[PDB]
Design a binder for this molecule. Sequence first.
Ligand code: K
Ligand code: K
Ligand code: K
Ligand code: K
Ligand code: K
Ligand code: K
Ligand code: K
Ligand code: K
Ligand code: K
Ligand code: K
Ligand code: MG
Ligand code: MG
Ligand code: MG
Ligand code: MG
Ligand code: MG
Ligand code: MG
Ligand code: MG
Ligand code: MG
Ligand code: MG
Ligand code: MG
Ligand code: MG
Ligand code: ZN
Lengths: 131, 51, 191
Amino acid sequence: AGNKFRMSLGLPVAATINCADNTGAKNLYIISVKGIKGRLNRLPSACVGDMVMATVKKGKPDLRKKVMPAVVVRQRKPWRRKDGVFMYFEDNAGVIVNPKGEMKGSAITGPIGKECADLWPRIASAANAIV
Amino acid sequence: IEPSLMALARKYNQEKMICRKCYARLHPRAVNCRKKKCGHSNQLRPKKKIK
Amino acid sequence: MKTILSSETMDIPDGVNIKVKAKQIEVEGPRGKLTRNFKHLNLDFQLIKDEETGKKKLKIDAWFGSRKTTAAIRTALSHVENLITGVTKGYRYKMRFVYAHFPINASISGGNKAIEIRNFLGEKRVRKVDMLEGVTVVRSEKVKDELVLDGNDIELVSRSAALINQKCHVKNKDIRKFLDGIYVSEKGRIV
RNA sequence: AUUUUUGGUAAGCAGAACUGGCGAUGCGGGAUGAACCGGAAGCCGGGUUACGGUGCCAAACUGCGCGCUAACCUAGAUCCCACAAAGGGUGUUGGUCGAUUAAGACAGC
RNA sequence: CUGUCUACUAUCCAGCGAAACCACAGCCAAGGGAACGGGCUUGGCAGAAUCAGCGGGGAAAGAAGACCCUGUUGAGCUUGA
RNA sequence: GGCUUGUGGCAGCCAAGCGUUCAUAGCGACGUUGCUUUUUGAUCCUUCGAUGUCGGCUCUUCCUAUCAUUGUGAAGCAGAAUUCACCAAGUGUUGGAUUGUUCACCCACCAAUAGGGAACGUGAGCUGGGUUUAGACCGUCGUGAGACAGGUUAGUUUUACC
Ligand SMILES: [K+]
Ligand SMILES: [K+]
Ligand SMILES: [K+]
Ligand SMILES: [K+]
Ligand SMILES: [K+]
Ligand SMILES: [K+]
Ligand SMILES: [K+]
Ligand SMILES: [K+]
Ligand SMILES: [K+]
Ligand SMILES: [K+]
Ligand SMILES: [Mg+2]
Ligand SMILES: [Mg+2]
Ligand SMILES: [Mg+2]
Ligand SMILES: [Mg+2]
Ligand SMILES: [Mg+2]
Ligand SMILES: [Mg+2]
Ligand SMILES: [Mg+2]
Ligand SMILES: [Mg+2]
Ligand SMILES: [Mg+2]
Ligand SMILES: [Mg+2]
Ligand SMILES: [Mg+2]
Ligand SMILES: [Zn+2]
């Protein structure tokens, strides 16, 4: 197909989101967003399907006190689909991945957005329900 | 590439003199550079060949 | 030091008709017409006719001219000689394709007045070059991967060859190793 | 401030010698300026100059002459003065000392 | 990363009605100059009369700098004067 | 701010050497010529009947000695990457932890996270954390009043209608 269309950003830096993967982390604390060139005073922000740098605040000791990549799979901020329907999730969630985009865990606890599944084949394969 | 065609291409790409001051590409028989910014320098070196 | 008189003369073959007026030189021959505007030269152009024989001569001289001014006499004479050669024999330039892996595909458009290069270093871009006035480009049959440029004006033929050559410059690579291109290999006369 | 001159990397820095000047002084010139150039002054008419100028601004020649420069860096354009160096140029213009040459000088056949 | 709403102002009108401040005044670039000009020199320019704001400049106003130094001026305090 | 440029910063010239050989791809010892006023000094010309004294925030513009981006020459340029140099200031040059900080040092992104001026831009534009009044504590010094290029805590930011 083509390329992802822009969607409303609702997770600026310092946002804490649930961890939907099986790694053992409970939440993800976003410290930066990949691909952001930015502007003065503007906080980098991520959306569903974006890759971010995050740390684990609650979880196994092995996962804490370090920086790892993560991909956002759910967001509460509504965004507009090309068909005109605005949609949103119940919570904010993400999954830990390696820089190549491979999931560190093996399963996803809840649903994931279609954009993230289209962008990341491994996450889609590990997902239960898309949208 | 055939030796004849290789030599033909090298005539345009390899056999040159390079000005030390401004790196200008000059004909193999050049004695002074043609560029004004280097004051038509006479400090020339051959273009280095692949070895 | 302002030499009093610098003069040079050239012989004109009987098969060429030449006219000079206000430093405007017209050259006529079997192959066609050529023109040149030498108004930028502060020289005196004179055509001398021998009544007994009938042969023509062109004399160009400079009065109280410096070395810089005097250097143009031979330039003008060589230009007139080139015009005569072009109008009697014509000019033929030969170009050869050089490539290591990707063969260069040449497509001559209608009238032998344009050329297309498509596979230069495996590039998907199409290179377009238009032949100058009076110059035609044909693909040689007896020589593999050879382009033949023919015309009456030496400057136009050479400039067309230069355009073809410069349209296929290698970029972002060591040109000493990547020698691909189209280069002038022979300069001659059609006749 | 010219010249002599000490400390200081230097300074529109700091300190001395002779003389002059500004201060206390206008006036013409240096576009402009306390010190530079000219020159010092009652109120006027005429004539002539000093320094400096005579393409316009702006009074006086696009005056009569010889060479050099062509600036694709904003060529250059007048003591103080409002900066430029070492190195370079096969740009061009003169000079100096050498070498080859009509028993034929240099380049290409 | 701003948007929006309410009241009172600002705004416009009737009536009423000060003060600060003010050498003369008020467009700029450069030059020189007391070494940062609104005025002088050379240029750029430049067209009646008015309204609401604004905080670049007026080296803005507010005070004969309280810092520092000087005076053969004090004063509070201390002591082995 | 002005003169100067020792010091700071930025360039050039010669070529002993380095660079598997090779002075000059890339460097440049011994020497030597410069430029700049975003360093710090030197001086004391202007201001003491007062030109609001750090830093940050906001906002505009300007410079090039170009970090990225456009187009190029060179290489000890196979490719990739990198390095040297040339036109070039059109566009851009970020989010955070500690520190009042300028500066510094890390985390992260990015094409890049270049360097600077504008009265060390900008307080009748803000702020007031620091310096720099009066309260108070500590250490050292002093017999003492008190001192302190030492530390600490609290400490009024005025006016436009010309
Ligand atoms: K960024
Ligand atoms: K009223
Ligand atoms: K002007
Ligand atoms: K006294
Ligand atoms: K008292
Ligand atoms: K210096
Ligand atoms: K001072
Ligand atoms: K003062
Ligand atoms: K800050
Ligand atoms: K308090
Ligand atoms: Mg900020
Ligand atoms: Mg005198
Ligand atoms: Mg008189
Ligand atoms: Mg000045
Ligand atoms: Mg006083
Ligand atoms: Mg007082
Ligand atoms: Mg006394
Ligand atoms: Mg070498
Ligand atoms: Mg530059
Ligand atoms: Mg810029
Ligand atoms: Mg004690
Ligand atoms: Zn050169």
